[PDB]
Amino acid sequence: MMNGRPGHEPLKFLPDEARSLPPPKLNDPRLVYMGLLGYCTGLMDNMLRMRPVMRAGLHRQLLFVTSFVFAGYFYLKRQNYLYAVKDHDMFGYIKLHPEDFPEKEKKTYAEILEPFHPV
Amino acid sequence: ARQWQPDIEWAEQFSGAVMYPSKETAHWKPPPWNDVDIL
Amino acid sequence: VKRFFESYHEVPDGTQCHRKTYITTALGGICGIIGSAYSVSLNPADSTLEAVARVGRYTFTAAAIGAMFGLTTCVSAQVREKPDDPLNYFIGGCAGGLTLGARTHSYGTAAMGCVYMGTAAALFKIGKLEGWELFPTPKV
Amino acid sequence: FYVREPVNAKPNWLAVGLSVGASVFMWIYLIQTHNEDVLEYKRRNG
Amino acid sequence: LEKTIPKSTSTLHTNMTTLTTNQKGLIKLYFMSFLINIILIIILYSINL
Amino acid sequence: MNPITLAIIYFTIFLGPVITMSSTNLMLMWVGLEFSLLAIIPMLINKKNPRSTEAATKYFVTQATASMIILLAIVLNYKQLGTWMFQQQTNGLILNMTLMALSMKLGLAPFHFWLPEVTQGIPLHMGLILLTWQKIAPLSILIQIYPLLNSTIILMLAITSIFMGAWGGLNQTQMRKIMAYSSIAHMGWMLAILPYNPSLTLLNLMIYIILTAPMFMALMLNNSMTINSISLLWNKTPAMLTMISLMLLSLGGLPPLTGFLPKWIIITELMKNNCLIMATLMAMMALLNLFFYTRLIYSTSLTMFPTNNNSKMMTHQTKTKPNLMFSTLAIMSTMTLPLAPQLI
Amino acid sequence: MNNYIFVLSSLFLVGCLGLALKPSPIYGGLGLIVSGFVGCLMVLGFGGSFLGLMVFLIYLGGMLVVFGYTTAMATEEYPETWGSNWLILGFLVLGVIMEVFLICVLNYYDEVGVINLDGLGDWLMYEVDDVGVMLEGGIGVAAMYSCATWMMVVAGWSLFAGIFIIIEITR
Amino acid sequence: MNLYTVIFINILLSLTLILVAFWLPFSMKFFLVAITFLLFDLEIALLLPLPWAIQTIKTSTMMIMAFILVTILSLGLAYEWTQKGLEWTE
Amino acid sequence: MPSTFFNLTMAFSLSLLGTLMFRSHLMSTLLCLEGMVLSLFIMTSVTSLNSNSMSSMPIPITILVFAACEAAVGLALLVKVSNTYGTDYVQNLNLLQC
Amino acid sequence: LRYGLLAAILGDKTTKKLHEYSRVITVDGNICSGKNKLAKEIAQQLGMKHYPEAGIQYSSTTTGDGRPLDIEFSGSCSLEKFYDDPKSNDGNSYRLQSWLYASRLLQYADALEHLLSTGQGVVLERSIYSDFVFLEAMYNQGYIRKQCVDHYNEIKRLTLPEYLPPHAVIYIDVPVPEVQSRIQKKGDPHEMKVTSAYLQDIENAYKKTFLPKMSEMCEVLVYDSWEAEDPTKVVEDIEYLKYNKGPWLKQDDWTFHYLRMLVQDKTEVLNYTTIPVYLPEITIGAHQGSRIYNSFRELPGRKYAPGYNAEVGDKWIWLK
Ligand SMILES: CCCCCCCCCCCCCCCCCC(=O)OC[C@H](COP(=O)(O)OCCN)OC(=O)CCCCCCCCCCCCCCCCC
Ligand SMILES: Nc1ncnc2c1ncn2[C@@H]1O[C@H](COP(=O)(O)OP(=O)(O)OP(=O)(O)O)[C@@H](O)[C@H]1O
C-alpha cells in the first residue's frame, strides 16, 4: 500500500526522516516482554535437551535476552516510523481535500428528538 | 479406582489408513513404517 | 445470456411463477451437471451407461430441488400478499429438502436439508433486500 | 561415573567467551545508539 | 437434543469428509478435474464479463 | 550425495525464489520457478523407492503444466502490449489463467489433489521446504499484481480450500497429509485477503512458517509419521508436549495465541470491505482444523497410549537433535500476541 | 502464396492435434518432428533465419532425438494400440472438419476480427527497413554477450546444474 | 521457390527409386549419453552467436562471458568424469 | 499474423488438453508438453520479428534451454518408473492413496 | 567436534583406514559350542576386537555408569523363566526375543561405528542375521504365535537392510546329543530343562535358512568341534579368504558417511523396533510405563543428561 509513495527509499530499515521521532526507552514493556521470551527460550532449550532448567547455560540465556532486546529496539523504532508516516500522509490528504472532510453540524440534545422506548 | 487410560481397543482406531471408515470402497490398509513398499 | 437468471429479480415474488420455476430448475440442472462431472471423473463407474445414469440422477434431482423451491416460494407469496418475507424462502428450502429426502430415501437427509436450505434461502433473500454483496470489489 | 565419556564432559570456553562478549557488546552498542538517537531528537526539536 | 444438534453436525461432516477423501491416486482423474475447473472458470469469466 | 552436489542443488533451491522476487521480467520469474522445480525433484527422489518416484512424477507433471500456462499468459501479454509486465490493460482471461496456474503451483483447491500424496511419499525435511520455501515465489508473483485480479474466483478458490482442508484433515491419520491440508487452509486464507491487503498475506505466511517448521522438527525428532507413533512421545521425549500442544492450538487459531491474529485481522479487513458472509463461512469452518488438532493434542499430551518395551532402551539412549531454533520459533509462535500492532 | 503461412499454421494445428490424440510415443515423435519443421518454416516466413535454423539443429537434432531414444530403450509397443490408432485417426479427421466449421463461423462473426480471410496474404509483414543493414536476428541473440548477460548466466547455470541433477536422479 | 523445387525433386527421386525396387520383378549408459548430448547441444545454441557478438564494442564483456560458458562446461564435464559417467564398464 | 496466432493458440490448447487427458502412457504427455513449448517459442519469435524488437530475441533461447532441462528430468523420472514397474503406465502409480 | 559432513570434508574419512583385517566376522553355532573361546582366539591372532554375545543387559552395561539395572528397567524378561516355564500366559518368550534382537542390533551398530571410525575389525557372536533361529524353534514348538512371528519379521525388514552384512561367517556345527551332554556337564538347573526338539529346530533353521541365505553375500566357513579347538587352521583359512560377492565393494566414502551417521545416532537404529503394533506380549500399560520411567529418571546419572548430574561428580553445570 504505502510502498509506492514519493521519497521512498528501497530496502532500508531506518531512513533519516525517522531520526526525528522520540526513541523508545529500554524499560518499554514490549522490550521487557521480548526479554522474558528470550529467557523462556533458554529454559525451553534446556528442558528439551534434558538439562537442569535454570541451572545451566547462563551464557546461552544471557545471549538470548540480549539478542531479543537488540532486535526489539530497532524493530520498534521502525514500526513507530511507519505509524508516524501513516498519520502524516493521512492528515496531508485531509488538508489537501477539504471538500470531502467537512465539519459535522453537531446539534444539541435539546433539539434532536430521539424516540423513547419503555421498559 | 484410578484414572482410566486408553487401551488397545481405543488406540487401534487411530491405526487405519483413514479414520471414520464408514465407506465400503475403503478397502485400504495402513502404509509401511519406512515408506518402502513390499515386493 | 445471463439475463435468464436476472429476469427472476425484476418483479416482486408472486408473479411470473412459470419462468421463475424454469430459472430455478436451470440452476439446479447446472449444479447437478457440475456435481456429476466431478463424481464421474473422480470415483468413476464401470459402464458409460451407469455413468450417464449417475449424471441423469443428479441432474434431475437438482432440477426438482430448484423447481419445487421456486414454485413453493411464489405460491406462498401468492396465497399470502407478502413478497418481502423470507419465510416464503424458508418454506421453499424445506420443500427442496423434502424432495431431496424423497429421492435419496432418508428422513435424516430430508430434515437436515429442510433446515439448512431454509436458512440459506431466507438469508439469500435478506441479503437481496438489505443490500448485502457477495464477491464485492475492494474499497478499504 | 560414565563409560562413554561424552562431548559435554567439560565446557566449550570458546563458546562461553564469544557469547559473553557478544552480550556485552550488544548492550554497549545499544546504550550508545539510544543516547545518540536521543541527542539527535533533541537537536532537531530544540 | 442430541440427535438434532451435535449428532447431526458429526454425521454431516463425517459424510462430507468421506466424500472428499475417497480419492485414489489417479493422475488421470485429478487432471480431468483440473480440466473441469478450467472450463468452469473460463465460463464464469466469458459469461459475467 | 556429496558436498558439491548438495551445494549446487541447494543454491539453486535458494536462487529460484530470489530471482522471482528480485526480477521485474516475468520471464525471469518463470526462470526462478523452473529452478525451484528442477532442484527440488532430486531431493524428493533421494530415497529411490516407488513412492518417492511416484511423488516426484506427479509434482513434475503438475508444476510443468502450470509453468507452461504461466508462460502462455506472459506471451499473450507480450503480443498485446509489447511489454514484459502485466499492466491495467491485460485481458482478464490472461490473469485468470495465470491465477489458475499459480494456484496449481501452490496447492490450492480444487487444484490440490497432488499435495497430500506427494508430501506423504516424501520425507520430513522435504515436506518442510515444499510447504514453506516453495510458497514464496508464486505468492510474490501474485502480490505484484494484486490490484488487477478477480475477487470472485479468488474467494471461490479460498473458500473451497478452507472447506477441503478441513474435510481432509478430519480423516487423515498421517502427520504429513494433515500438514498438507493445513497448508491448503492457510493458503486459502492468504488468497482470500490478497486483493484487499497483501501485507496480511505475508503476515499469515510468516506465521504459518514459524508454526510449521518447528512442528516438522518435532516430528523428525523421532520420525513419528503417524498418530500412534507420536503418541509414544510421552515416553520417548515428554519435554516436547508443552510446546506441541500450544503450537497446534495456535495453528487452529485459538484467541490467546499468535495463530489467532491472522484470522482476526483478515476478518476485520473483509468486514471493512463487506465480505462478511465469506468471513463467517471461513471462521466457522476453521473449527474443524481446530477439532482434528485437538484430537492430536489428546493422543499426545492429555492421555497416555499403550507404549512398548524397547522404548526402555530408547530411554537408555541419549539425544542431541532439537537445536535452538525449535524453542525460539515455538516461543515466537505461541507467545507473541501482545506485539500484534507491530506485526501488523 | 497468400495462403502460405495459413497452410503452415494449419499443418501445425493438425500436428498438435495428432499429439493431443495419443497414438503412441513414436508416431507422436513423428508428429512433433513435422510440427517443428513447419514451425521453422513459418519463422523463416516471418524472417527468423537464425531462430528457425536453431530450432532445426537443436529442437529436432537434439531434443526429439533423445525423446525417440529414451522411447525405444524404455518403452514397449503393445498390440492393442493399432485398432485404437485407426480409431483416433478417424477422430483426427472429425476434428479437422470441426475446426474447418469453427473457422467458417468465426469468419462469419468477425470479418476484420479473428481472421481476415480477405486480407490473408496481407498483415504478414508490417514494416521493414529497406535500406538497412544489421537488422537480422543474430544481432539480437548476440546481445546476450554485451547486454542481457543475465540471461546468459541464467541459462549456463541451468545447464551446469542439470548435470548434477541428472546424475543424482539416475543413480 | 527454388529450395522447395530442389527438395521436392529429391523426395520424388527417392520415392521413385524405392518404388522401382518393388515394381521391377535396459542400460542407463545410453540415456546418460543422450542427456550429456542435450546439455552440450544447448551450449552450442548459446555459443553460435559469437560471429555476431564479436562485432560489438563490449569486447571485455564478450571475452568474459564466453570464457565463463566454456569453463563451467569443462567443469561439469570433469565432474561427470570423476563420478564415472564415461566408463561403460557395467 | 492474427490467423497464425489464433492457430498457434488453438494448438497450445490442444496440447494442454492432451496433457490433462491421459491415455495410459507418459511419453504421450511429455510430448504434448514439448508441443506446448514449441508453440510458445514460435509465438514469441513471431511477435519479436513482427515488432522488430531485437532486444527480446534471447527469450526464445532461454525458454528453449529451460524446456530442454525440464524434458530431461521428466525423461529421467520416466526411466525410473519403467526400471521399477516395467511400463510407462499411469495405473501403476496408484500408491500414496493411503 | 561431532562427526558429520564437516568432519568428512576435512579428512575424517573411511577408506584411509580399511587395512586388511578391517572386516567383521561372526562365529555362530548352537548354544554350547566353543564360540567365546574361538572368537577371542581369532581376535587375538588377527589383531581385531571382540564383542561378546549380547544379552538382556547389553544396553544397561554400555550406557551410564556401566552397571546393570533391574529387569523392569532392562527387559522385563528372563531366560531362566523361559527355560523353566515356556508357554506361559505372560509373554516372556517373545518379550525376550524382541529385546534380544534389539540388543544385538545395538551391538551391530556399536561395532560398525568402531570399524568405520577405526579400521580395527570386529568379531561378534550370533547377530541379527541369526537371532531368528531361536524364534522359529519356539514357533515350531508352540511357545509363540504367528502374530509375534510376523511382528518380528516386520521389524527385521525395517531394520536389517540398512546395515552391511558380515564378511566371514564361521558356523561351528555340533549335534543335539553332544549339546545336551555339554549342558548337563556345564551345569545349569534351567538350561538342563531344555528339549532336544528345540535344539534340533535351532540346528535345522541354521542349516536350511542361514547358511543358504548368507553364502550368497559372505564367505561361509563350516567347522566341527575338532577342527575347532585347533584354531590356527581357521585363522589361516580366514587370512587366505577371498572377499568378493559382497556389497562392501559397492561402498564409497559417502555411503560410509551416511551409514556412520545412522550407526552413530542410536535412536534412528531403534525407531522401528519401537513401532506401535499392539501385541498383548509387549504392549505395556500407561500406569506401569509411567511408574517405570519416572523411577528410571529418579535413579542417579539418569535424571538429566550425562554431563549434567552433579550427584555423580559433574561440575561446571552452569557453563555447559
Ligand atoms: C497468564 C495468562 C494465561 C494465558 C493463557 C495460558 C494458556 C494455558 C497454559 C497452557 C500451558 C500448558 C499447556 C500444555 C500442557 C502440557 C501437558 C504436560 O506437559 O503434562 C504432561 C506431562 C506429564 O509427564 P508424565 O510422564 O505423566 O510424568 C511427569 C514427567 N514429566 O508433562 C511433562 O512431561 C512435561 C515435560 C517434563 C519436563 C520436566 C518438568 C519441567 C517443567 C515442564 C512443564 C512446564 C510447564 C509450564 C506451565 C506454565 C503454565 C502457565
Ligand atoms: N535369541 C535367543 N533366544 C533364546 N535363548 C538365547 C538366545 N540367544 C542366546 N540364548 C541363550 O544363551 C545361552 C548361551 O550360552 P553359551 O553356551 O553360548 O555360553 P557362551 O558364553 O557363549 O559359551 P560358548 O561360547 O562356549 O557357547 C544359551 O543357553 C541360549 O539358549
Every domain of chain I and the residues it spans = 2-98
Beta strand pairing call for J24-26 and J168-172: parallel
d(CA F324, CA F329): 9
- CATH number of the domain at H2-90, out of 2.60.40.420, 3.40.309.10, 1.20.58.1610, 1.10.10.10? 1.20.58.1610
Name the experiment that determined this structure: cryo-EM
Q: What's the grid cell of residue G98? A: 470441426
> What backbone torsions phi and psi does residue J295 show, to the nearest 5 degrees?
-70, -40
Which chain E residues have a beta carbon less than 8 Å from that of F152? 44, 48
Name the 3-class secondary structure at F16. Answer: helix
Sheet (strand J24-26) strand order:
J49-51, J122-124, J24-26, J168-172, J219-223
Exposed / middle / buried, residue J268 (Cβ in 10 Å: 0-12, 13-18, 19+): middle
Q: Cβ < 6 Å from ligand 1: which residues?
A: A 47, 53; F 234, 238-239, 241-242, 245-246, 256, 301; J 290, 294
Residue G151: partners with Cβ closer than 8 Å, 6 or more residues away:
G144, I58, I59, I61, I62
Residue A28: partners with Cβ closer than 8 Å, 6 or more residues away:
A76
Cell 495405473 sits on residue: I91
**What Å resolution does this PDB entry report?**
3.2
F49 touches chain J (CB under 8 A): no
**J20-35 per-residue burial string, b: 16 or more CB within 10 A, e: under 16:** eebbbbbbbbbbbbbb
**Touching pair E, F by Cβ (3+ pairs < 8 Å):** yes
Residue B18: Cβ within 10 Å count: 22
CA F172 vs CA E21, F69, F244: distances in Å: 8, 32, 18
Residue F258: partners with Cβ closer than 8 Å, 6 or more residues away:
F207, F210, F211, F250, F332, F333, F334, F335, F336, F337
Nearest atom (ligand 1) to Cα of J293 = 26
Query: Which residue ranges make up each domain of chain A?
Result: 1-97
Residue G33: Cβ within 10 Å count: 17
Distance F245 CA to ligand 1 centre (A): 10
Return the closest-CA partner of residue I66 out of F6, F189, G151: G151
d(CA A91, CA J254): 65
Q: Is the backbone of residue F274 left (phi > 0), alpha (psi -120 to 50) or beta?
A: left
Please name the amino acid found at residue I61.
I
Residue of chain I with shortest Cα separation from B35: I96
- Cα dihedral J201→J203→J208→J214 (10° resolution): 130
Residue G107: Cβ within 10 Å count: 15
Cell 556389497 sits on residue: J247
Name the 3-class secondary structure at J53. Answer: coil
- Cα dihedral F161→F163→F166→F172 (10° resolution): -80
Name the 3-class secondary structure at G157. Answer: helix
Return the closest-CA partner of residue F106 out of F183, F209, F176: F183
Residue of chain G with shortest Cα separation from I78: G74
Nearest atom (ligand 1) to Cα of F240 = 36
d(CA G69, CA D5): 59
Q: Is the backbone of residue F66 left (phi > 0), alpha (psi -120 to 50) or beta?
A: alpha
Residue G14: partners with Cβ closer than 8 Å, 6 or more residues away:
G92, G96
**Nearest bound ligand to the CA of residue J55:** 2
Strand residues in C7-121 grouped as ranges (E):
none
The DSSP code sequence of F194-229 is TTT-HHHHHHHHHHHHHHHHHHHHHHHHHT--BHHH
Q: What angle do CA B28, B31, B34 make, to 5 degrees?
A: 170
CA A90 vs CA A85, A96, A97, F195: distances in Å: 8, 10, 11, 22
Which chain G residues have a beta carbon less than 8 Å from that of F1? 168
Beta strand pairing call for J24-26 and J122-124: parallel
CA J40 vs CA F308, G124, G165, J231: distances in Å: 36, 91, 49, 11
Cell 472458470 sits on residue: E41
Residue C104: Cβ within 10 Å count: 13
Q: Side-chain half-sphere of A57: how many Cα atoms within 13 Å?
A: 25
Residue G108: Cβ within 10 Å count: 8
Closest CA to ligand 1's atom 27: J290
Please name the amino acid found at residue E48.
N
Distance J142 CA to ligand 2 centre (A): 20
| Residues of I at the H interface, defined by Cβ within 8 angstroms | 61, 64-65, 68, 72, 75-76, 79, 82-83
| DSSP 8-class letter at G57 | I
Q: Are G115 and I10 in contact (CB under 8 A)?
A: no
Exposed / middle / buried, residue J227 (Cβ in 10 Å: 0-12, 13-18, 19+): middle
Residue G164: partners with Cβ closer than 8 Å, 6 or more residues away:
F4, F5, F8, F9, H76, H79
CATH number of the structural domain I2-98: 1.10.287.3510
Q: Cβ < 6 Å from ligand 2: which residues?
A: J 31-36, 53, 79, 97, 100, 131, 134, 191
CA E33 vs CA E36, E40, F72: distances in Å: 5, 11, 21
Q: How far is CA F326 from the centre of its chain?
A: 18
d(CA I14, CA I17): 5
Q: Are C34 and E36 in contact (CB under 8 A)?
A: yes
Residue J283: partners with Cβ closer than 8 Å, 6 or more residues away:
B8, F306, F307, F308
